[PDB]
Design an enzyme around this catalytic site. Structure first.
Site, PDB file in Angstrom:
ATOM      1  N   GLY A 142     -29.448   7.697 -48.316  1.00  0.00           N
ATOM      2  CA  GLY A 142     -29.193   7.684 -49.736  1.00  0.00           C
ATOM      3  C   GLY A 142     -28.555   8.948 -50.261  1.00  0.00           C
TER       4      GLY A 142
ATOM      5  N   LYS B 103     -40.271   7.848 -40.618  1.00  0.00           N
ATOM      6  CA  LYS B 103     -38.883   8.100 -40.235  1.00  0.00           C
ATOM      7  C   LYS B 103     -38.742   8.017 -38.726  1.00  0.00           C
ATOM      8  CE  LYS B 103     -37.210   8.609 -44.531  1.00  0.00           C
ATOM      9  NZ  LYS B 103     -38.032   7.387 -44.957  1.00  0.00           N
TER      10      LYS B 103
ATOM     11  N   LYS C  97     -24.774   5.677 -39.927  1.00  0.00           N
ATOM     12  CA  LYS C  97     -25.504   5.132 -41.046  1.00  0.00           C
ATOM     13  C   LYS C  97     -25.765   6.226 -42.086  1.00  0.00           C
ATOM     14  CE  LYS C  97     -29.261   4.003 -43.528  1.00  0.00           C
ATOM     15  NZ  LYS C  97     -30.295   4.836 -44.167  1.00  0.00           N
TER      16      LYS C  97
ATOM     17  N   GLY D 238     -28.063   3.999 -53.211  1.00  0.00           N
ATOM     18  CA  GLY D 238     -28.605   5.333 -53.386  1.00  0.00           C
ATOM     19  C   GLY D 238     -29.251   5.308 -54.728  1.00  0.00           C
TER      20      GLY D 238
ATOM     21  N   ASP E  54     -31.279   0.654 -42.564  1.00  0.00           N
ATOM     22  CA  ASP E  54     -31.608   1.101 -41.187  1.00  0.00           C
ATOM     23  C   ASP E  54     -31.650  -0.066 -40.200  1.00  0.00           C
ATOM     24  OD1 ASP E  54     -31.786   3.824 -42.002  1.00  0.00           O
ATOM     25  OD2 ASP E  54     -33.969   3.770 -41.984  1.00  0.00           O
TER      26      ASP E  54
END
Ligand code: GLU
Ligand code: GLU
Ligand code: GLU
Ligand code: GLU
Lengths: 255, 258, 258, 255
Positions: free
Chosen positions: C11, C217, C8, C45, C162
């Protein structure tokens, strides 16, 4: 005390609204009486370290002393040349002091080269050109200078603020005060010492566990300059104007 | 052209090394032949929003303004006044242009007040004192100015770079170029208008030729020109071989007046 | 490692040709020696927000989600499913990797439903059918998948990359790497933890070592690992000489489990 | 009618919710009866042109035919390979057709080179590799292919959709329908014509002011292929399933 003075502000000073109010009041009280050219120089306190923790950026170290990787230098530039510099500017504005924020690269004030490939974006400071700062001083501005430089090839560099201050004071012919939380060395206070005496007291374990680092930094600066550098605390702040006029209120390291 | 010139950099410029290399190659090309006082004005770019995402901080942008809460202004000041400004400065050094990084508060160059308390730390720009910049220019430095300001009470302020550019130009008696991805305004035969008045702009909006986002962009230019009381150039960084001519006063995009 | 692998892309990767060149050089290096089925998953992004600013469209991002109104979803689908995906595809071609651009709806690979009507066109991902991707992989193509989906009723959906990566990995029986600027989690002696359980993470959060944005995160990684019922790697693109090893199963950043 | 069919959708068709509902219903009705491999190919209608107007991006032209500058190709890729492609996918999903979106570069289906330095990022289409599409067809997917390609050196290319469709049909050995708002040519309808007859009718001003362009495009495709291409409208949509089975409901241009 004619002749310029560089006042270098330590990390714990920047982390403290208390300390800044006192420092800036002291600058005002001094200016009313005296008219010596003043330059502030700074690194970054916990502003940097806390931001880097937030971003999971490690404090790397290759057998001694910090590494600034490619993936850290922008963020550090931000906290240091940005947040810290403009915070001090906000304090100057708040106290009606005409101030200008700069970094080392502005006017090539302090020249910076690559200290060592293995430390990444860490700069070695060395005296540069005084013109820009002299111009600003002569026009009535107080420069507030951050310890970020740029190599001649265009790369941002994180520079030890103490070493930056030393390179600046040499560039300007200025006296130098390293202002922090260490008021002074005792044995009954010591107002003046040579650097060699300061090494001796460290060697024989008189100079306090934590803060050998602060005396080492003053004594290195003194020797690099070939003339004395002051250590002083913001704590007894009613004494700071006398310091800025030449009185060693803390401890002078002579050479 | 002998007037001072404010060049305002739009976001995309800061986001791309190709764009920066073109901009700076153009600046060097122009300074080889011409000595008109140049000032760079800039905002943030991608890097503020990258950083907000990295710190999982919320983003609200509306009407050209980012709601800037107390707990974001320092970080934002870092990205704009710090990283962006110093990156630009590094480009200058790399191109042997003697530049000096400032923000709006330096020398009270552009005065800022609180725009609106519910936007948090967002500043309204107005003209301040020209003294500092005039001193730097007269000594041969190219100032590079970020769009962060400080209120008289010592609060950090995030300011719209277009409005700050206008306040700056007014302070300096300078001409103004808004450099971005927009090359000019099209006249709905699809052709570029070299010189456009306010009256022509209204006609184009009323007729639905300038629509949506171009309306906002065109109004930002017109509001600039009205404040300054002189024309404002809009141009793109793309055909960078044309940028020296632009900096020497040729309207290579669209010049806006009235 | 012989399991399929979902990589994955965060950005910053899409925002920078240096980062893309490192990523793709690593992919070529890895495919020289190893043949494990690889799938790229990506979001937007900088370029979505650049485009929103160019069109003077409002932005509200909160809790990892962009409020995606009816009048923005097509444009966003364009930037993500179009420009981003095809840019990645162009990087593949340029590196002689036979790749195929998909989105989540292709083959009902990841099923999406409406997350919450007040967010507009934002999708909740869940595992769909592996058939399409398995067919592409078995024929030697490296799928590059954008995080746009389509509801069974035919509505376009902007999905958190995600969460889409997680749904994808689950569908594929794949391992998962979340590649971004974050290199790993630090243990508050400031050291990188190679392998971190959920229990260790709580300890670090309770003690205030993992704070703020790292919390978000770290939770995104843990939520990934819990859904998949196996560990998830976190790594940075920076030391790209290490990325082949990462793709071959070595945890060069932080491996998260439990 | 065994053997694949490329259905190329015209701009005005994509701009019309009405037309798409009819087209997609027609695809469903056809599939219930017949089992011929179907591939959709498309350009971009007003979605592209309107977006570019919003962004002040001109429709440049160097003595004839469009220019796609460096500063346009990303945005166009977005509208075309993104918005238009995924819109058609949403229609397939809505009608329970297993579909896969692709562009020309996927599997090197249609190879693209630089048409001309002065037109910028415009691609010349030419037949590529059938493998990817054949694989998808054999697995039961309907590919929906956009007219964006990538050069072998990694550059995005805007390609005339008609020419792309022609290169695709040659790659696949497929018949080709150019579906638009032109139902057919009259003189009393004409069901079949050679390309040369179509040129004649243009030459003598029988073929309608606007829509010479549509016949020229069919007749070029026919000649490039060396076999016939259909022109047909979405309007009479109850007739579209017969078209997809081989019946020339509009006008066939033979060669
Ligand atoms: N502000 C700290 C460290 C900053 C630096 O050297 O970069 C100090 O000088 O004590
Ligand atoms: N985040 C800033 C950006 C400054 C600018 O680019 O104009 C604002 O909205 O105020
Ligand atoms: N704008 C998208 C971004 C997709 C992603 O990068 O995760 C969202 O919040 O849903
Ligand atoms: N959609 C239009 C033009 C798209 C293109 O050729 O790029 C058509 O084929 O009629």
């Amino acid at each position: 005390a004619m002749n310029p003075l560089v006042i270098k502000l330590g990390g714990v000073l920047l982390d403290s609204e208390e300390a800044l109010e006192r420092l800036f009041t002291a600058l005002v009280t001094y200016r009313e009486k005296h008219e010596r050219p003043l330059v502030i120089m700074h690194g970054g306190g916990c502003l940097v370290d806390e931001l880097m923790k937030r971003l999971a950026l490690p404090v790397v170290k290759k057998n001694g002393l910090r590494v600034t990787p490619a993936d850290q230098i922008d963020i550090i530039t931000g906290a240091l040349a940005g947040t810290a510099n403009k915070t001090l500017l906000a304090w100057a504005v708040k106290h009606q002091i005409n101030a200008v924020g700069l970094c080392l690269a502005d006017g090539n004030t302090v020249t910076v080269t690559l200290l060592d490939a293995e430390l990444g974006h860490v700069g070695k400071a060395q005296p540069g050109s005084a013109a820009l700062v002299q111009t600003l001083l002569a026009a009535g501005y107080m420069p507030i200078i951050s310890s970020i430089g740029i190599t001649v090839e265009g790369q941002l560099m994180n520079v030890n603020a103490d070493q930056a201050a030393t390179a600046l004071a040499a560039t300007l012919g200025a006296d130098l005060i390293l202002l922090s939380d260490v008021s002074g060395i005792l044995d009954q206070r010591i107002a003046e010492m040579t650097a060699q005496k300061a090494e001796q007291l460290i060697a024989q374990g008189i100079i306090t566990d934590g803060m050998v680092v602060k005396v080492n930094a003053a004594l290195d600066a003194a020797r690099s300059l070939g003339r004395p550098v002051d250590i002083a605390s913001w704590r007894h702040s009613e004494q700071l104007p006398a310091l800025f006029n030449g009185v060693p209120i803390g401890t002078r390291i002579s050479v």
